[PDB]
């Protein structure tokens with residue numbers, strides 16, 4: 001069995017190997033990459049996502065989210081408070097202000113220490129989930145706006161045509177902006193490109209150990225657990241690496257830098273934080289190996305998690321028994 005300790009693997013494809021996305025994901029998996037739940041892909045040196053980032057300041061962040069924490073330093077939830085619209089130019093200025101900027105630090109490790117010590121005492125503002133793309137239409141390789149769709153994958157594997165579309169999302173981040181512990185909708189893969197700015201640190205639990213995280217989460221967030229049988233779908237819970245180590249939860253960590261891709265694999269729980277002003281683009285995708293995860297994915301039916309139009313059809317075709325109750329949660 002390849003990669004039995006489930007370590008995060010880092011890949012360095014040649015420009016030739018960068019041509020066929022599906023084939024390269026399949027190569028990574030042949031080397032055991034999926035066992036970690038997360039892989040890093042450094043693009044060939046010849047490749048670029050676009051020519052420059054000099055003209056992005058007029059993109060609108062219609063609903064910036066202030067991320068307010070409750071709990072203790074290592075075990076907390078976060079809620080999102082909606083703020084007034086601002087442009088990317090305005091957001092970058094705010095990220096760089098004395099109130100919100102990255103503190104002085106020695107190295108990534110010192111910054112990580114400062115994150116876990118101090119995150120809960122601040123409420124950073126995140127421009128998340130903004131439909132759109134920063135890839136130039138002439139970038140032909142690993143263009144997250146030109147991938148094969150999840151609906152076409154299901155049609156190719158299963159023979160059923162379904163409604164829905166699949167488009168990318170932009171994330172504009174600042175120091176301490178946080179992504180809570182989650183897997184993707186319907187336990188899909190995701191791919192994330194860090195277009196510009198400061199790094200993003202990731203933590204991940206191997207898929208084969210996901211249930212261990214869920215059991216710890218039920219213990220640490222006991223009211224949430226009673227309210228919903230899949231409350232991690234709400235994407236609000238944070239658990240520090242110190243707490244995971246104290247509870248024997250297997251995980252790994254890695255820092256992504258500008259110009260690098262990260263791929264999350266089906267049922268790979270992940271969480272993390274941004275180091276400073278940055279912009280990432282991400283999208284879900286599927287492969288034939290996903291189908292069996294999709295069929296078994298937990299769902300939120302308390303109604304909090306409220307998800308895309310396109311997820312309907314996945315639940316309807318792959319999880320027909322769940323379908324009824326789940327759409328009651330959606331309506």
Ligand SMILES: O=C(O)CNC(=O)C(=O)O
Pocket residue numbers: 171178179190191192264270280282283
């Ligand atoms: O970048 C972020 O805030 C969150 N991204 C993801 O969880 C992902 O790409 O799967």
Ligand SMILES: [Mg+2]
Pocket residue numbers: 055056057058059
């Ligand atoms: Mg612009």
Ligand code: NI
Pocket residue numbers: 182183184190264270
């Ligand atoms: Ni994710």
Ligand SMILES: [Zn+2]
Pocket residue numbers: 227228229230231233234300301302303304305
């Ligand atoms: Zn729920």
